[PDB]
Amino acid sequence: DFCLEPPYTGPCWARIIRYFYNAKAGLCQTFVYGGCRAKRNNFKSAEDCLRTCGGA
Partner 1 sequence: IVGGYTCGANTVPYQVSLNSGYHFCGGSLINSQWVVSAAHCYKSGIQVRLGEDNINVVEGNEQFISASKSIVHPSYNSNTLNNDIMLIKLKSAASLRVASISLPTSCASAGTQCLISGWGNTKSSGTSYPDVLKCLKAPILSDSSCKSAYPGQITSNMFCAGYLEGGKDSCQGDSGGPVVCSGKLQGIVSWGSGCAQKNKPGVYTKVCNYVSWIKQTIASN
Measuring CA to CA, which residue among 40, 37, 47 is closest to residue 5?
40
Q: How far apart are CA 21 and CA 31, in angstroms?
A: 10
Q: Does the protein bind partner 1 through residue 45 (CB under 8 A)? A: no
- The region of 4-12, 20-28, 48-56 touching partner 1 under the rule CB under 8 A is 4-12
Nearer to partner 1, 48 or 54 (CB): 48
Q: Specify the residue, 37 or 51, whose C-beta has the smaller distance to partner 1.
A: 37
Give the interface with partner 1 as residue ranges (CB under 8 A).
Answer: 9, 11-17, 32, 34-37
